[PDB]
Design an enzyme around this catalytic site. Structure first.
Site, mmCIF file in Angstrom:
data_model
loop_
_atom_site.group_PDB
_atom_site.id
_atom_site.type_symbol
_atom_site.label_atom_id
_atom_site.label_comp_id
_atom_site.label_asym_id
_atom_site.label_seq_id
_atom_site.Cartn_x
_atom_site.Cartn_y
_atom_site.Cartn_z
ATOM 1 N N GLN A 90 10.557 -1.390 -2.179
ATOM 2 C CA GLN A 90 10.071 -0.043 -1.935
ATOM 3 C C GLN A 90 11.080 0.801 -1.170
ATOM 4 O O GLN A 90 10.959 2.027 -1.169
ATOM 5 C CB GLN A 90 8.755 -0.094 -1.163
ATOM 6 C CG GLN A 90 8.903 -0.662 0.252
ATOM 7 C CD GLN A 90 7.605 -0.667 1.016
ATOM 8 O OE1 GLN A 90 6.803 -1.598 0.910
ATOM 9 N NE2 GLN A 90 7.379 0.392 1.788
ATOM 10 N N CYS A 103 4.180 1.295 0.309
ATOM 11 C CA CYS A 103 3.612 -0.039 0.093
ATOM 12 C C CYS A 103 2.269 0.019 -0.632
ATOM 13 O O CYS A 103 1.973 -0.825 -1.489
ATOM 14 C CB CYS A 103 3.441 -0.761 1.433
ATOM 15 S SG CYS A 103 2.423 0.129 2.647
ATOM 16 N N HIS A 150 0.568 -2.716 6.511
ATOM 17 C CA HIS A 150 1.420 -2.929 5.344
ATOM 18 C C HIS A 150 0.571 -3.494 4.223
ATOM 19 O O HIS A 150 -0.054 -4.537 4.393
ATOM 20 C CB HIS A 150 2.562 -3.886 5.701
ATOM 21 C CG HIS A 150 3.542 -4.130 4.592
ATOM 22 N ND1 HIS A 150 4.198 -3.107 3.939
ATOM 23 C CD2 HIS A 150 4.004 -5.281 4.052
ATOM 24 C CE1 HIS A 150 5.006 -3.617 3.027
ATOM 25 N NE2 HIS A 150 4.915 -4.934 3.079
ATOM 26 N N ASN A 205 5.416 -9.461 -1.804
ATOM 27 C CA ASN A 205 5.837 -8.341 -0.967
ATOM 28 C C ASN A 205 6.729 -7.406 -1.785
ATOM 29 O O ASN A 205 7.130 -7.724 -2.899
ATOM 30 C CB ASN A 205 6.549 -8.860 0.294
ATOM 31 C CG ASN A 205 6.560 -7.865 1.446
ATOM 32 O OD1 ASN A 205 6.030 -6.762 1.365
ATOM 33 N ND2 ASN A 205 7.163 -8.284 2.551
HETATM 34 C C1 LIG Z 1 2.987 0.783 4.224
HETATM 35 C C2 LIG Z 1 4.485 0.519 4.018
HETATM 36 O O1 LIG Z 1 5.061 1.262 3.178
HETATM 37 O O2 LIG Z 1 5.045 -0.380 4.652
HETATM 38 C C3 LIG Z 1 2.662 2.200 4.686
HETATM 39 O O3 LIG Z 1 3.142 2.369 5.998
HETATM 40 C C4 LIG Z 1 1.161 2.498 4.554
HETATM 41 O O4 LIG Z 1 0.701 2.979 3.534
HETATM 42 N N1 LIG Z 1 0.389 2.193 5.607
HETATM 43 C C5 LIG Z 1 -1.045 2.408 5.594
HETATM 44 C C6 LIG Z 1 -1.747 1.252 6.301
HETATM 45 C C7 LIG Z 1 -1.727 -0.086 5.567
HETATM 46 C C8 LIG Z 1 -2.019 0.052 4.077
HETATM 47 C C9 LIG Z 1 -2.718 -1.032 6.242
HETATM 48 C C10 LIG Z 1 -1.429 3.706 6.302
HETATM 49 O O5 LIG Z 1 -0.928 4.009 7.374
HETATM 50 N N2 LIG Z 1 -2.361 4.428 5.668
HETATM 51 C C11 LIG Z 1 -2.908 5.676 6.165
HETATM 52 C C12 LIG Z 1 -2.238 6.940 5.638
HETATM 53 C C13 LIG Z 1 -0.845 7.152 6.204
HETATM 54 C C14 LIG Z 1 -0.815 7.638 7.649
HETATM 55 N N3 LIG Z 1 -1.278 9.006 7.804
HETATM 56 C C15 LIG Z 1 -0.583 10.101 7.485
HETATM 57 N N4 LIG Z 1 -1.126 11.304 7.682
HETATM 58 N N5 LIG Z 1 0.636 10.047 6.986
#
Ligand SMILES: *[C@@H](C(=O)O)[C@H](O)C(=O)N[C@@H](CC(C)C)C(=O)NCCCCNC(N)=[NH2+]
Length: 212
Positions: A19, A25, A159, A175
């Site tokens: 990625q 992710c 993640h 992953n």
């Molecule tokens: C995952 C990655 O690319 O490593 C990426 O950080 C991600 O999508 N994280 C998610 C949480 C996981 C799936 C548990 C996340 O943070 N989702 C919420 C939306 C993003 C945060 N909020 C904003 N406004 N950007």
């Protein structure tokens, strides 16, 4: 359900992806489950577009993170293009689904595994690859090279990855950090520890696509 599952051995898993620095992710995780259920239902293994989900899932935040659930809902409502039609760019751009012709595949819905329940997750994995989340921020996970991973790690999930199998003492995870990380891109995470969160929070939030 059997003591070992490995969807790679059934030809239902495409090559490991990277990625990059983008927080995509959630899109990679969703695509693994789409590639898997289409193989299971139709007999053909195809690569589908992470970039399309990144651009087009309005509930997510592009390279600032997102939700496997809303990515899977998007594929059930509209569909998804082949990766070759809509290749990965590592940056969010405009949604280009309508400019790229008819969709390649479509699903019928999305389901959540009962959270904090190891057996429920194994049951789902026996049926198809599942989107799961875990805490990847710890150095132990970042530096993982091989073996059944026990941590150390907390449960502060951050993640999204994909569960593509299991065995007596682990769940097998694809992953999205390239083929040089872990076991050619995979990690086996310890199971059976009695912690309802799962090792690294692995049982927190799991979704899979439905396809008639
Ligand atoms: C995952 C990655 O690319 O490593 C990426 O950080 C991600 O999508 N994280 C998610 C949480 C996981 C799936 C548990 C996340 O943070 N989702 C919420 C939306 C993003 C945060 N909020 C904003 N406004 N950007």
């Amino acid at each position: 359900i059997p003591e070992y599952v490995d969807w790679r051995q059934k030809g239902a898993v495409t090559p490991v992806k990277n990625q990059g620095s983008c927080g995509s992710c959630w899109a990679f995780s969703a695509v693994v489950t789409i590639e898997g259920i289409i193989k299971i239902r139709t007999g053909n293994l195809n690569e589908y577009s992470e970039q399309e989900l990144l651009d087009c899932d309005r509930r997510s935040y592009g390279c600032n993170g997102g939700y496997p659930w809303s990515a899977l809902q998007l594929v059930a409502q509209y569909g998804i293009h082949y990766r070759n039609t809509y290749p990965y760019e590592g940056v969010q751009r405009y949604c280009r689904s309508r400019e790229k012709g008819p969709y390649a595949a479509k699903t019928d819905g999305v389901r959540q595994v009962q959270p904090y329940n190891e057996g429920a997750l194994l049951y789902s994995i026996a049926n198809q690859p599942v989107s799961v989340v875990l805490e990847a921020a710890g150095k132990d996970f970042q530096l993982y090279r091989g073996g059944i991973f026990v941590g150390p790690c907390g449960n502060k999930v951050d993640h999204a990855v994909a569960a593509v199998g299991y065995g007596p003492n682990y769940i097998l995870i694809k992953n999205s950090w390239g083929t040089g990380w872990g076991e050619n891109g995979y990690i086996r995470i310890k199971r059976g520890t009695g912690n309802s969160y799962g090792v690294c929070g692995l049982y927190t939030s799991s979704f899979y696509p439905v396809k008639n």
